[PDB]
Symmetry: D2
Subunit: 255 residues, 4 copies
Amino acid sequence: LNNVVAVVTGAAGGIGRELVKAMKAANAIVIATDMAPSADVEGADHYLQHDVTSEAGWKAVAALAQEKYGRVDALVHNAGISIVTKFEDTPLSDFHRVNTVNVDSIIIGTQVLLPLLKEGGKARAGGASVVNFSSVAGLRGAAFNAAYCTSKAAVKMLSKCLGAEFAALGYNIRVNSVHPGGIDTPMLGSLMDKYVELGAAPSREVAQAAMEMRHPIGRMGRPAEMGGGVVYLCSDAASFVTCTEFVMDGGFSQV
Amino acid sequence: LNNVVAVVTGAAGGIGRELVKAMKAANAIVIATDMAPSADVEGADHYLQHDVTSEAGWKAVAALAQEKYGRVDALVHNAGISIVTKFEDTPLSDFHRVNTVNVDSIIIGTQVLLPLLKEGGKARAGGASVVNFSSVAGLRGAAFNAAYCTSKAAVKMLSKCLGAEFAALGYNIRVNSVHPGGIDTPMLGSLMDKYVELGAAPSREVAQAAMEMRHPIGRMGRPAEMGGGVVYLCSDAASFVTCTEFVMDGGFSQV
Amino acid sequence: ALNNVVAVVTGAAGGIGRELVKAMKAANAIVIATDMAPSADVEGADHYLQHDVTSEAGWKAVAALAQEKYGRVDALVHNAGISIVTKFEDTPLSDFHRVNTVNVDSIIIGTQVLLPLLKEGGKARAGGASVVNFSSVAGLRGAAFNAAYCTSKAAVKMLSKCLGAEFAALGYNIRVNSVHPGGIDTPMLGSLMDKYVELGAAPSREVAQAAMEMRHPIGRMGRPAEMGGGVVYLCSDAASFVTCTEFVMDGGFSQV
Amino acid sequence: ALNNVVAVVTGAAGGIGRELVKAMKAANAIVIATDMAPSADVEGADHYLQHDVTSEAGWKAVAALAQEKYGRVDALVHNAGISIVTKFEDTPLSDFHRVNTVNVDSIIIGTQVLLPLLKEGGKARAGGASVVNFSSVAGLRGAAFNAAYCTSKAAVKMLSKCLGAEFAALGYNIRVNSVHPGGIDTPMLGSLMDKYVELGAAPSREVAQAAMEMRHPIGRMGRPAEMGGGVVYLCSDAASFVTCTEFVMDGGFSQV
């Protein structure tokens, strides 16, 4: 990932934090972001208090990189929220509230960074790499998981839309969705806990008697293994990778 | 489909009326609902003017089935929109306008027809049949169908999540998904005008053939051909057909 | 709807074998049910023939009748299946080959011998002649102790769409549809778990059946009867435009 | 991280095969490259062998070189391919079988005989060893005049969701993965578009060439070289939690 201007949202969460530091490990010129003021950022040159649900937010991202590097050669649409809760008890406003961050996190972003992710596509042979974080829960939907699965199913599909159309409009901006599994983040630290609140679990360790084993590979993911193809995608390695479904899920779904 | 109190939104759609007709030879009690005040909706047995995202509107359709029968066996949504648009020029409103008529017509409407749906699986062994139309475009990427495909993707996914959640909470309601290709409808129609106005297809003759040749069946799907697959869905012959990418394309996808 | 439809169903004296015939006759299309059984008590099945489905000499004899007796086939039904449950490391090469042979080659030879009698299907119903390839969720998804089995099914799976696409824009009118049945109750499936326990993967045959049923959101397995109308539908012309399809009748099992 | 990783590589003299080699020694992993070709100057490759993959002999020709010289296999590769286009109704079952053993059996004795060293390959390495099989677009979506091919590449796809799932639930650390490439311009994929005239698929050769080009949302025909990158990933332990799943390098083809 040499001479590549990047950016990554949500990179102060479990997966987020690593993606920045293992993208300077990739030696890409990262810019980090998160909802928060400012704290400890490793590798990344610059940070922005960011919420992928804030249009004005995003501009600040464009105008920065604009001055800062004058191009954008990567984009990891990452920041997103996972929720588990009774459907005939969930409002429509909850349903949007998920999409807001997970789906319309991708769009307003990439619309704002569109003048930029142009320039970046041109100055590299492989292209401007665009990475959306869907899931396995966007591949296979889950029970009591209704609005969380429809999120990553759009984060599945929007990608195809973004690769093929951008290809259409000439641009060389590769787009590719991302499909993790039941990642060990403190988010999921209290999401099995929410399978409990819906009865399907006597205790927290009996729902944590499902997620690892729905994986053949037999264990909760770790937020380390996830950067490996993320750099890959962003780099002229995956030059010929568009529209794709990049899946790292312990063989969760195949089975 | 004996003793089938069944609901058919957008019954004045190209596909709409022909499902209405093709459920009568099966001998079902149809309920035609649409945006129009009253037309000659051929086949139906009770007609409503029905805004498909109006919450209190699905309470006038839950009203009648409650009135006349006190059960809902089948639930078929249909009123589904497609914009053709330049992704970077697309309003988010208009992105927000499609998830609403389509994806968000399920989250509301089922809840209001849910009371009479848990009745269906008690009145019928083969259960209660909920059919959100998805489509091929909500399976696979299609540029300048940028705000249309993501929709039916969740329409693809939720179907799953609902159907799964209901069966996990021992409702006898199954939920499937129909995925028609470029169906000889006034929807497959004048969107080839949009393509044209985009200046994206040269002519409709071109546009016709691009949507003709992506099916190696050559023809683009007659609305009554989808009749069979709907019927099967509703029946107790489809009592093991839940949460399915049961297809009807003529060859748009698998190749 | 099955009118005028001369059909060939294999594995007829099987479970899903018996039932397919029943429902097709219940729609009232001329079944020509076939199996390896020397003779078979099959409700309605207008015909019965000892037919080895790997054997060419087999489909020959199928075709003799279907020509002489109707001079066409309107619905070819490869239901003829075996299942092999075994560790890849221990699975002989030929075990792989015995399976594919019976479940893919079986299918291949007759869509080649009965292909003549299918081209008239191209003619006798505009709604094409209905090829009904029985894959499975093994054809859909993967499994431990089902190596050769799933691979075999996924050839069936794929062969279908090859035949959906070829037989189409060659003018031949023939739809090829792929049924992928989920857990279906037979002294086939009611004993395919034994093996996992025979291996020892599961302690008991109760537990063999446990996660079996629960791996479908619906929570149970399938009736032989609950595999009925899906063939009928494919063989019904309500779907003249429905080919290359994985017709998934598994109880959502795959999708979640 | 392709360091202290002993590979094995088939279809070596093949055009992609060659790209795959360079792009893995310039990552500093320990190559054992294999092919049937009599003579091969396989750039990057530490060792070349003359190997028949429809042969446990050929496969135990590999095994000794990894037996004697090293003591493990960390990245076995199965890269051989035949790419037949045939009329379904002009494929003998033999021509069906020829495209089995080179394409599917090759992966079996590759993985039955090398299984010990795959295990030994999975002990020093974190997320484990990987088998990174080579299917094809054909192996996922369908296409005409690829009957025996698109199956053969489907019988890859699935075999490996079998093999992925069977080893992990065996307490080995020996991952199994697959790629499905799109249109890669090679002499391997060379004048095969002539066939799409000898039958009559599209008028000429260069509009058959651009007919293949058309489909691709990416717009262009890939390169042999491009595969290697998405092969250099899967093998490394930074692609540890990638198993059973179908890593895709097609250029958008499948996705629209």
